[PDB]
C-alpha cells in the first residue's frame, strides 16, 4: 500500500482536505443568516461533540482498513461488520464523494475562471448607488455560468467557463495521477502555506476597510457578539451541525481514504486534532474575517445579512468583488481572493475524488493512472448535468452534501463504535497515538453523538418527506434519477469486486 512520506505532509494534506470552499463561502453565509455570534455557540459545541469525535473515528477506520489494503467504506464496513448490507451501506462512502465532487469541482472551475479574468483585468467597471455597483458583477457572474432571466430550467455556460472547467479537471488529474506522497503531499506542502499567506493578507486588507456606512470591525463584532435568544431555534443548531460536517469533510468518506494511507503504527490522534484545529482556524478566524466584515463595512450589518440570505454565491462571486472594485487596486485584490478560493477548492476536490480512485485501485485492482483517468471521465461527464441544468447543483448539494453526510456519519459511528464494539474501537483509536483522547470522549462517541445525529435526522426527515413528493421542477427529478443511477452503478462495481475476490 502507498503511504504518506512525512507527518508534516500528512497534516497539510488532511488540512487541504478540510480547508476549502466551505470555509470562505459556506461558513460566512451560514453564520450571517443565523445571526452572527448566535450561530457561534452551537457551532463550537457541534465542533466538540460531533466534529472531533467523528474526525478521530474516521481516521481510525481509515488507518484500520488501510492496514489490510482497503481505503474505502464498502470494504471497511465489511471488515468491521460481516454483512452484505454493510457493503451496501458502504456504497455511500463512494456515492457521496462522487456526487459532491461533480458540482464541487465545477464551482472550483468558477473560482479559477474568475481568478484568470481578474488577473488579466477583464471585469465589469462600476462608476454611489449600491445596485449600480453590484448589478455589473451580477451580470458578470450570470453571463459566466449562463443564468436565465426568469426561472428557466436550462443554463447556458459560456465557452470560457466550459474550457476553464476542462482545465480544472486537468489540474486535478495532474495532481492525483502522481499518487499520495508525490502528487497530493508535494502539492499540499505548497498550496497550504500559499493559502494561509493569501488568507492573512486578505484578512488584514479587509480589516483596513472603513466607510461612512460601517467598518470591518463592525462585522467582526457582529460575528463574535453572543446572542442567546437564538439558542431556542433548532434551525441554528441544524445549520451549525451541517456546517461542521461539511467543513471537516466528515461523512464524505474522504477522511477515511486519506487515513488508509497512514501507516498502521503512526499516530492518528494528534494528527487528526491538528488537522481539525487548522480547519477551524482557517474557518472562523480567516473565512469569517473576510467576506462578512467587508460587506458590513460597505453596506452595513442589515444589508450584509440581507445579501448573505440572498444566496451562497452572491456574497463570494458578486458582493465582495464589487466592494473591491471601489478600492485602489481592487481588481488585483479580487484576483487574490479568487486564487485563494481556487487553491482551497482544489485541495479538497483531489480529496473527494481520491475515494473513488482508491476503490478502483484496491478493489478492482486498477492501476493508479487508469483509476484516476476513469474517475475523471465519470466526474467530467456527470458534470454536464450540473452545468446545463438549473437547480441540479442545489439538489446534489442537498442529497449528498447535507443529508447524506449526516446519515453516513451516524452509520459509520454506529458500525464502528457499536457493532464492532466500543472498547475495541477505542483501543483502535488510541493505538500508536502521540497523545491520547480524553476519557470523556469515549462516552461522547458511544452515546451523545449518535443520539444527537439520530434526532437531527428524525427532524429533517419529518420536515422533508412531505415536501419531496410535491416538487414542480423536472430538473430535480432528472438529477435524482441520475444520482440514483450512480448509486446503482457503484453498487454494481462493488458486486464485481466482491465476485473477483472469490
**Residue ranges of the binding site for phosphocholine:** 84
User: 84 is in the binding site of which of ligand PC, ligand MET, Na ion, none (Cβ under 5 to 8 A by kind)?
Assistant: ligand PC
Q: Shortest approach of Na ion to residue 264 CB, angstroms?
A: 26
Neighbouring-strand partners of residue 95: none
If phi > 0 it is left, if psi is from -120 to 50 it is alpha, else beta; for residue 319 that is: alpha
Nearest CB to ligand PC, comparing residues 232 and 499: 499
Q: How far apart are CA 454 and CA 178, in angstroms?
A: 40
H or E stretch at 191? helix 186-207
Letter string b/e over residues 40-59, b meaning 16 or more CB atoms within 10 A of that residue's CB: bbbbebbbebbbbbbbbbbb
Q: How far apart are CA 134 and CA 148, in angstroms?
A: 18
Q: Shortest approach of ligand PC to residue 502 CB, angstroms?
A: 12
Q: Shortest approach of ligand MET to residue 379 CB, angstroms?
A: 12
246 belongs to the binding site for ligand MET (CB under 6 A): yes
Q: Shortest approach of ligand MET to residue 446 CB, angstroms?
A: 26
Nearest CB to ligand PC, comparing residues 4 and 407: 407
- Which of 10, 11, 13, 21 is close enough to bind ligand MET by CB under 6 A? 21
Site for ligand MET in 419-478 (CB under 6 A): none
Long-range own/partner contacts, residues 118-126 (CB < 8 A, 24 or more apart): 118/321, 118/331, 118/332, 118/334, 118/335, 118/337, 118/338, 119/332, 119/335, 119/339, 121/331, 123/321, 123/325, 123/331, 123/334, 124/325, 125/325, 126/322, 126/325, 126/326
341 belongs to the binding site for ligand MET (CB under 6 A): no
Beta-carbon contacts of 364 under 8 Å, excluding residues fewer than 6 positions away, are 371, 493, 496, 497, 500
Nearest CB to ligand PC, comparing residues 93 and 288: 93
404 belongs to the binding site for Na ion (CB under 5 A): no
Residue ranges that bind ligand PC, judged by CB under 6 A: 83-85
276 belongs to the binding site for ligand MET (CB under 6 A): no
| The three cell numbers locating residue 168 | 480544472
User: 352 is in the binding site of which of ligand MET, Na ion, ligand PC, none (Cβ under 5 to 8 A by kind)?
Assistant: ligand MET
CB atoms within 10 A of CB 454: 13
| The three cell numbers locating residue 330 | 481592487
- Which of 9, 22, 113, 179 is close enough to bind ligand MET by CB under 6 A? 22
Nearest CB to ligand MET, comparing residues 23 and 325: 23
For Na ion (CB under 5 A), the number of binding residues is 11
252 belongs to the binding site for ligand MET (CB under 6 A): yes
Q: How far apart are CA 314 and CA 302, in angstroms?
A: 16
Nearest CB to Na ion, comparing residues 110 and 298: 110
Q: Interface with ligand MET by CB under 6 A: which range of 20-28, 209-217, 391-399, 492-500?
A: 20-28
348 belongs to the binding site for Na ion (CB under 5 A): yes
Alpha-carbon distance values, 223 to 18, 167, 291, 293 (Å)? 22, 37, 11, 9
Q: Shortest approach of ligand MET to residue 349 CB, angstroms?
A: 6
Per DSSP, the residues of 282-347 read IIIIIGGGTHHHHHHHHHHHHHHHHHHHH-HHHIIIIIHHHHHTTSTTHHHHHHHHHHHHHHHHHH
Q: How far apart are CA 4 and CA 262, in angstroms?
A: 6
| The three cell numbers locating residue 319 | 458582493
Beta-carbon contacts of 309 under 8 Å, excluding residues fewer than 6 positions away, are 32, 33
175 belongs to the binding site for Na ion (CB under 5 A): no
18 belongs to the binding site for ligand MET (CB under 6 A): yes
CB atoms within 10 A of CB 206: 24
Q: What is the DSSP letter of 151?
A: S
Q: Shortest approach of ligand MET to residue 187 CB, angstroms?
A: 15
255 belongs to the binding site for ligand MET (CB under 6 A): no
Q: How far apart are CA 341 and CA 30, in angstroms?
A: 17
| The three cell numbers locating residue 239 | 445549520
| The three cell numbers locating residue 344 | 482551497
Nearest CB to ligand PC, comparing residues 30 and 72: 72
Q: Shortest approach of Na ion to residue 91 CB, angstroms?
A: 25
21 belongs to the binding site for Na ion (CB under 5 A): no
User: 104 is in the binding site of which of ligand PC, ligand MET, Na ion, none (Cβ under 5 to 8 A by kind)?
Assistant: ligand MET
243 belongs to the binding site for ligand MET (CB under 6 A): no
- Which of 220, 351, 353, 387 is close enough to bind ligand MET by CB under 6 A? 351
Q: Interface with ligand MET by CB under 6 A: which range of 17-25, 88-96, 230-238, 332-340?
A: 17-25
- Which of 34, 72, 247, 257 is close enough to bind ligand MET by CB under 6 A? 247
95 belongs to the binding site for ligand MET (CB under 6 A): no
Contact residues toward Na ion (CB under 5 A) are: 16, 18-20, 22-23, 247, 279, 344, 347-348
Contact residues toward ligand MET (CB under 6 A) are: 18, 20-23, 100, 104, 246-247, 249, 252, 254, 348-349, 351-352
Amino acid at each position: 500500500r502507498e503511504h504518506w512520506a512525512t507527518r508534516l505532509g500528512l497534516i497539510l494534506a488532511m488540512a487541504g482536505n478540510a480547508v476549502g470552499l466551505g470555509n470562505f463561502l459556506r461558513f460566512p453565509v451560514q453564520a450571517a443568516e443565523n445571526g452572527g455570534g448566535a450561530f457561534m455557540i452551537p457551532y463550537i459545541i457541534a465542533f466538540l461533540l460531533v466534529g472531533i469525535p467523528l474526525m478521530w473515528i474516521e481516521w481510525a477506520m481509515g488507518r484500520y482498513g488501510g492496514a489490510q489494503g482497503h481505503g474505502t467504506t464498502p470494504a471497511i464496513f465489511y471488515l468491521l461488520w460481516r454483512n452484505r448490507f454493510a457493503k451496501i451501506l458502504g456504497v455511500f462512502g463512494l456515492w457521496i464523494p462522487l456526487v459532491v465532487a461533480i458540482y464541487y469541482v465545477y464551482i472550483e472551475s468558477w473560482t479559477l475562471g474568475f481568478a484568470i479574468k481578474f488577473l488579466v483585468g477583464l471585469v465589469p467597471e462600476p462608476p454611489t448607488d449600491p445596485d449600480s455597483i453590484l448589478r455589473p458583477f451580477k451580470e458578470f457572474l450570470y453571463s459566466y455560468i449562463g443564468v436565465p432571466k426568469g426561472d428557466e430550467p436550462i443554463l447556458k455556460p459560456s465557452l470560457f467557463a466550459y474550457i476553464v472547467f476542462l482545465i480544472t479537471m486537468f489540474i486535478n488529474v495532474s495532481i492525483l495521477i502522481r499518487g499520495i506522497s508525490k502528487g497530493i503531499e508535494r502539492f499540499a506542502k505548497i498550496a497550504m502555506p500559499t493559502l494561509f499567506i493569501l488568507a492573512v493578507f486578505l484578512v488584514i486588507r479587509v480589516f483596513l476597510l472603513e466607510t461612512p456606512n460601517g467598518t470591518a470591525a463592525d462585522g467582526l463584532n457582529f460575528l463574535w457578539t453572543p446572542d442567546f435568544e437564538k439558542l431556542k431555534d433548532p434551525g441554528v443548531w441544524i445549520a451549525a451541525v451541517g456546517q461542521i460536517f461539511f467543513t471537516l469533510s466528515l461523512g464524505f468518506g474522504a477522511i477515511i481514504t486519506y487515513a488508509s494511507y497512514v501507516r498502521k503504527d503512526q499516530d492518528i490522534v494528534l494528527s487528526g486534532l491538528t488537522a481539525a484545529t487548522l480547519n477551524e482556524k482557517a474557518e472562523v478566524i480567516l473565512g469569517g474575517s473576510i467576506s462578512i466584515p467587508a460587506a458590513v463595512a460597505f453596506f452595513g450589518v442589515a444589508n450584509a445579512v440581507a445579501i448573505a440570505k440572498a444566496g451562497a454565491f452572491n456574497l463570494g462571486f458578486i458582493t465582495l468583488p464589487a466592494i473591491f472594485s471601489q478600492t485602489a487596486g481592487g481588481t488585483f485584490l479580487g484576483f487574490l481572493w479568487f486564487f485563494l478560493l481556487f487553491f482551497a477548492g482544489l485541495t479538497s476536490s483531489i480529496a473527494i475524488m481520491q475515494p473513488m480512485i482508491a476503490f478502483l485501485e484496491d478493489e478492482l485492482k486498477l492501476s493508479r493512472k487508469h483509476a484516476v483517468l476513469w474517475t475523471a471521465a465519470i466526474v467530467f461527464f456527470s458534470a454536464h448535468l450540473v452545468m446545463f441544468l438549473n437547480k441540479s447543483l442545489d439538489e446534489m448539494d442537498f442529497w449528498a452534501g447535507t443529508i447524506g453526510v449526516v446519515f453516513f456519519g451516524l452509520t459509520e459511528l454506529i458500525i464502528f463504535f457499536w457493532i464492532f464494539g466500543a472498547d475495541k474501537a477505542w483501543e483502535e483509536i488510541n493505538r500508536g497515538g502521540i497523545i491520547k483522547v480524553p476519557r470523556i470522549y469515549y462516552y461522547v462517541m458511544r452515546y451523545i453523538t449518535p443520539a444527537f445525529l439520530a434526532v437531527l435526522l428524525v427532524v429533517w426527515a419529518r420536515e422533508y418527506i412531505p415536501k419531496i413528493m410535491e416538487e414542480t421542477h423536472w430538473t430535480v427529478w432528472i438529477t435524482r434519477f441520475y444520482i440514483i443511477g450512480l448509486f446503482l452503478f457503484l453498487t454494481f462495481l462493488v458486486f464485481l469486486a466482491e465476485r473477483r475476490r472469490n
